[PDB]
């Protein structure tokens, strides 16, 4: 199953130095405007009202925290409680707030303002003390890129298959949150020297809780933070490189819509082979499992394209 919550990120300073407008009318709880700004039948100013309705929709003025007990607490709750395999998506196009909402302010760890990622390991490794008192018990993270259909650890640059990532033990809330940082902050410089290559690329950090003699999983949650969902229109560059990372990104980002469909209905047989992105990522799609995606929306008239295309998106996966 999926949850779908959407994300007004408020005007940054810039923004409001530019005088741009926020097109973005929050009404309640599950219900959104977007207000588009057209010149048509002619070529005179009307707005364009866009409703839609999700799960939930945070507003401009709520806090990380506020989301992370939101959407993330009850995931950790079924992980420990229940032996739920969990996920968590951030969606949208590069500047919406991806990573503000995962991991806070810049510079990451310094800053006091954390993300949903810092609050989600103080309280995995609280409930751990809750569940073990006698190191039966552990937390075995992952943490790579797909770029290009590939795959690049980002604990270790050269591509590994998934049996070949790194599978590392960490035993507190700080170690876990240092391996996620310095990971997010590898992916920035660009493992594969592209431009941007972090709104480019996914990347996926993996969570599990083992029964450490047995070596076996008693739940997991994956935290994905996806490509910029505008990027598919690198398909159209001349640099070889971009032009494969836009047909990477439209084929991935289907095929996760396509995968979260099949899950929701058509059940018997999950299209996972669609795209890299969804082959490693197969087992969230299996009925039990519970997922969340948060789609981060940029409020501005020069991103009105994007919004809308996100919150289409957003509406059709909830499908």
Do not use: W
Not at 57 to 69: I, M, R, S
Not at 111 to 116: K, L, Q
Not at 191 to 211: C, F, G, P, T, Y
Not at 277 to 302: C, E, H, Q, W, Y
Request: proline share 2%.
């Amino acid at each position: 199953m999926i949850k779908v919550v959407v994300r007004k990120r408020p005007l940054s300073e810039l923004e409001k130095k530019k005088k741009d407008s926020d097109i973005i009318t929050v009404k309640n709880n599950c219900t959104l405007y977007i207000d588009e700004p057209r010149y048509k039948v002619d070529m005179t100013k009307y707005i364009e009202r866009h409703e839609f309705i999700v799960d939930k929709v945070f507003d401009d003025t709520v806090d990380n925290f506020t989301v992370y007990e939101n959407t993330i607490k009850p995931l950790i709750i079924d992980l420990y409680e229940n032996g739920c395999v969990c996920s968590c998506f951030a969606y949208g196009q590069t500047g919406s707030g991806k990573t503000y909402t995962m991991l806070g302010s810049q510079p990451y760890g310094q800053s006091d303002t954390p993300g949903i990622f810092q609050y989600a390991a103080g309280d995995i490794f609280t409930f751990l003390n809750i569940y073990d008192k006698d190191n039966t018990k552990g937390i075995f993270i992952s943490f790579y890129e797909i770029y290009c259909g590939k795959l690049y650890d980002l604990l270790q640059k050269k591509e590994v298959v998934v049996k070949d990532l790194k599978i590392l033990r960490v035993l507190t809330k700080e170690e876990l949150i240092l391996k996620m940082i310095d990971g997010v902050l590898l992916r920035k410089i660009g493992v594969n020297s592209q431009n941007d290559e972090s709104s480019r690329s996914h990347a996926i950090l993996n969570i599990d809780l083992k029964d450490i003699n047995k070596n076996t999983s008693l739940g997991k949650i994956a935290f994905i933070d996806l490509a910029g969902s505008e990027r598919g229109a690198d398909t159209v560059s001349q640099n070889k490189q971009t032009q494969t990372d836009g047909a990477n990104i439209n084929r991935s980002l289907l095929a996760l819509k396509e995968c979260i469909r099949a899950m929701d209905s058509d059940k018997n047989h999950i299209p996972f082979r669609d795209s890299e992105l969804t082959k490693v990522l197969r087992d969230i799609f299996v009925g039990k499992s519970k997922s969340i995606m948060i789609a981060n929306i940029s409020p501005t008239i020069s991103c009105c394209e994007q919004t809308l295309n996100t919150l289409r998106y957003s509406s059709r996966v909830k499908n």
